[PDB]
Amino acid sequence: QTFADAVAASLPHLRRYARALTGEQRTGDAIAARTLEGLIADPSVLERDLEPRLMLFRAFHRTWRREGAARLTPNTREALLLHAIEGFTAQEIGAVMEVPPETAADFIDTALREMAESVAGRVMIIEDEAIIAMDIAAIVREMGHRVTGIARTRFEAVRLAREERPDLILADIQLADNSSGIDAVNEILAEFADLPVIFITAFPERLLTGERPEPAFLITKPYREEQVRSAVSQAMFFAS
């Protein structure tokens, strides 16, 4: 319908959002696929109501409220991620979660306030460009976390992981829009499989095809401070 196609064109965006809320690729992709299946199986109705992307995210949230699969206040990490990775406003965030825009702002504020109360953890960065590594590290330290080290190659990473085993890996392998550095991602995911692994990339859609083993957390390049904080804070929740 070009519309029904526009909804399937936002499926990788939902895979990213679902992977972050569940902390796993397998679980995130499964829920993201079942959301599109149900939207397709529905005959018309409730459309035109929303823009194609927002409607798919809204369909996700309707099921998210029934069942997931406490410490953090519910609805807050959801609104924060929608704000950080998708750039949604409080008004679009209110439409997706079916709350007033002022209430959606309260979700983001409470999320940002609990991030200030988070317990410290250890992060290792894999990064070649020095100036990026030092800016990323400065953010992680202002967050209250400790930077184990900066491995300039994925060869170095196994060394620094032995000396001090972090609880989180930040990786930027200077990937491109090619499919060449596909085995490099699989290697780093397999090495640190028991750790949450965030990948910095300028082409997130390439890592959002539920075909290969892919990360559950992503930092879009060029990065924004807020989206780096959201990624690390979300990943340093499934850390041990």
Numbering used by the authors: 3 to 71, 89 to 259
Copy out sentences from the published article reporting this entry, exactly as the authors wrote them.
RT-PhyR and RT-PhyR′ were solved as a crystallographic trimer and a tetramer, respectively. Unsurprisingly, no electron density was present for the disordered loop in RT-PhyR′. Aligning the two PhyR paralog structures shows a reasonably high degree of overall similarity (2.7 Å Cα RMSD), with a notable major shift in the position of the loop connecting the β3 strand (immediately following the phosphoacceptor aspartate) and subsequent α10 helix (α3 in standard REC nomenclature). Adding other PhyR structures into the alignment (left), it is evident that RT-PhyR′ adopts an unusual conformation not routinely seen in other REC domains. This large-scale shift in RT-PhyR′ is likely related to the unique position of a conserved Q residue (Q193), which “leans in” and diminishes the solvent accessibility of the phosphoacceptor D (D191) (right). Two residues in the α9 helix of RT-PhyR′ also adopt distinct positions: a well-conserved R at the N terminus (R173) and another R at the C terminus (R184) “reach out” toward the typical position of the β3 loop and α10 helix, respectively. Notably, RT-PhyR′ was phosphorylated only at the longer timepoint and without a marked illumination dependence, suggesting that it is a nonspecific partner. On the other hand, addition of BeF3- to RT-NepR′-equilibrated RT-PhyR′ did not cause any substantial spectral shifts, showing that RT-PhyR′ binds RT-NepR′ to the exclusion of BeF3- rather than cooperatively. However, the analogous interactions seem to be inverted in RT-PhyR′, which exclusively binds RT-NepR′ when provided with both RT-NepR′ and BeF3-, suggesting a negatively cooperative function for this homolog. In contrast, the absence of a conformation representing the final inhibitory RT-PhyR′∼P/RT-NepR′ complex strongly suggests a phosphorylation-independent function for this homolog, the details of which remain unclear.
The GSR is a gene expression program that enables bacteria to cope with a range of adverse conditions such as oxidative stress, heat shock, and UV exposure. This response works using a so-called “partner-switching” mechanism, whereby HK activity—and subsequent phosphorylation of a downstream PhyR regulator —controls the activity of a transcriptional inhibitor known as NepR. Stress activates an HWE/HisKA2 HK, phosphorylating the PhyR and promoting sequestration of NepR away from σEcfG, allowing transcription of stress-responsive genes to occur. Exploring downstream effects of RT-HK, we identified two homologs of PhyR in the genome, RT-PhyR and RT-PhyR′. In the structures of both RT-PhyR and RT-PhyR′, we observed a typical arrangement between the SL and REC domains.
